């Protein structure tokens, strides 16, 4: 693609500049170019990839929710206003699905298959679950939900065998899988149980950590607690 002529290191450098400038679409394009060089990604590079696409899809998701709410209101004594709301919601939806397909394509060709260390493999499988979850949010679907579930479950199995309960990747995975259960899979009890168990097992391991690792882990634990407060 358009980044094929740029050095890998220059793409990474420009992704970091784009982040500082809050130019997340550019950041994502640079990171896609870096992945397509075919080398594995370091921890910092994986995080740049994730930040870029999370911000892009996050804006699309927020826009889709605004438009979907307007569309649902129009379908209630509501005056007919024509096809425009549906058309524009569909436009945003299609762009969102395209970004998710792009991310899933990078994971399948060939990030996941080359990822052997637990930290990288869990990271990518969590991403796979996340982007199928975003597809599920707009789908009208069973197979998409099962794809998200399967990716999260494989990531969970590796993380529980290979990572301590305070590891931030393990914690963020459990957080997002719990959101999947609550918001996608119609399984609030599973969501609550997973969040509780994850929080409690991390609590019991905090004593092993340095001050800086403690800060990293407790930040994500607080998100688990915030959700439990909302859900119970």
């Amino acid at each position: 693609g358009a980044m094929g002529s740029m050095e890998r290191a220059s793409l990474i450098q420009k992704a970091k500049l784009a982040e500082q400038a809050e130019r997340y679409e550019d950041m994502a394009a640079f990171m896609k170019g870096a992945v397509e060089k075919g080398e594995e990604l370091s921890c910092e590079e994986r995080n740049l990839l994730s930040v870029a696409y999370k911000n892009v899809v996050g804006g699309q998701r927020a826009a889709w929710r605004v438009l979907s709410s307007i569309e649902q209101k129009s379908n209630e004594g509501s005056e007919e206003k024509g096809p425009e709301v549906r058309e524009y919601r569909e436009k945003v939806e299609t762009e969102l699905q395209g970004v998710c397909d792009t991310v899933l394509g990078l994971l399948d060709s060939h990030l996941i298959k080359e990822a052997g260390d637990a930290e990288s493999r869990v990271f990518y499988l969590k991403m796979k679950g996340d982007y199928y979850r975003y597809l599920a949010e707009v789908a009208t679907k069973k197979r998409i939900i099962d794809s998200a579930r399967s990716a999260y479950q494989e990531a969970m199995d590796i993380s529980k065998k290979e990572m301590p309960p305070t590891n931030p990747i393990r914690l963020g995975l459990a957080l997002n899988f719990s959101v999947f259960h609550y918001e996608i899979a119609n399984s609030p009890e599973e969501a609550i149980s997973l969040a509780k168990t994850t929080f409690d097992e991390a609590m019991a391991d905090l004593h092993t950590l340095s001050e800086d690792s403690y800060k990293d882990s407790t930040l994500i634990m607080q998100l688990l607690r915030d959700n439990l407060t909302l859900w119970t």
Partner: peptide, 5 residues
């Protein structure tokens, strides 16, 4: 519901 950063 909050998801990961």
């Amino acid at each position: 519901s909050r998801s990961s950063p």
